[PDB]
C-alpha cells in the first residue's frame with residue numbers, strides 16, 4: 001500500500017491537520033511538527049515531532065529564524081519520520097515563527113529523500129499586519145525552492161458578526177483538507193478508474209505553483225455540474241486551466257460511479273484545459289456518499 005504522510009508544521013498547520021484528523025482522510029498518516037511543546041501535548045494528531053528544545057526570550061518565537069534553527073537542529077528526527085513515504089504533504093499557516101521557518105526545512109528533508117512533496121499553505125489576513133505578511137512571503141519564497149508543488153491560499157481571498165477566530169480559520173482548514181484529500185485519496189481509496197501514481201507524479205513533480213478548485217452535485221447531470229462548479233470555483237477564477245502544464249482531477253462518489261460519468265468529467269476538464277500539457281483523471285470511492293459526486297481539480301505548473 002501507498003505510504004502518504006501529512007505534516008502540520010507550527011500552530012496554524014497543526015490546527016489544519018487536526019481538522020483533517022477529525023474530518024478524516026483515508027489511508028494517510030498524520031504528524032504534527034512544532035517548537036511548542038504544549039501544543040504537541042494537546043494535539044489529537046497521533047504522531048508528534050518536537051523541534052528545538054521547546055524552551056523559549058519574550059516574543060522570540062515570532063521570528064521565522066527560530067523555527068528554521070529549531071528544525072535544523074532536529075533534522076535527524078524529521079528524516080527518520082519521513083523516510084519511506086511515497087508522498088508528503090506539508091500544511092502550514094505562513095506568517096508566524098514556526099510554520100514560516102520550519103516548513104521549508106521539512107520540505108527540503110523530504111525532497112532530499114526523493115519523496116514527492118506538496119505544500120498547502122495559507123497567507124495571513126491583511127489585518128494581521130505587514131510584518132507577518134512579509135514573513136509569510138519570505139517563507140513562501142524559501143518553501144518554493146524545496147517542494148514539488150505549492151498551493152498558496154491567501155486568507156483574504158477566502159473570507160462578519162458571529163464569526164469567531166476559530167470560525168475564521170475553519171474556512172482555511174476546509175480548503176487545505178480538500179486539497180490534501182483530493183490528491184491523496186486517488187491513491188489510498190481508488191474507484192473504478194484507478195489513477196496510476198506515475199500519472200500523479202507526472203503532474204505534480206517539480207511543477208511549481210498549483211491551485212485547487214472543487215464542486216459537488218447530485219442528479220442526472222451530476223458529473224457535468226460538479227466539474228463545471230470546480231472550474232468556476234472562487235480559487236480558480238483567475239487561473240486559465242489552459243495555462244497549467246498539468247491538471248489532476250479526482251472524481252469522488254459512491255459505488256454507483258459510472259464510466260460515462262468518468263468520460264463526461266474528462267471531456268469537461270479537457271474542454272477547458274490546454275493540450276500542450278499533461279492531464280490525469282482518477283476516481284475515489286467513498287462508500288458513504290449517495291447521490292452526490294464531487295470533482296476536485298488541481299491545476300499544476302501555473303505561472
Ligand SMILES: Nc1nc2c(ncn2[C@@H]2O[C@H](COP(=O)(O)OP(=O)(O)O)[C@@H](O)[C@H]2O)c(=O)[nH]1
Nearest residue numbers: 010011012015093094095096097098099124169
Ligand atoms: N488554519 C489556521 N491558521 C492559523 C491558526 N492560527 C493562526 N493561523 C494563521 O497561521 C499563521 C501562523 O500561525 P501561528 O500559530 O501564529 O504561528 P506558527 O506556530 O508558525 O503556525 C498566522 O499568522 C495566521 O494567519 C489556526 O488555528 N488555524
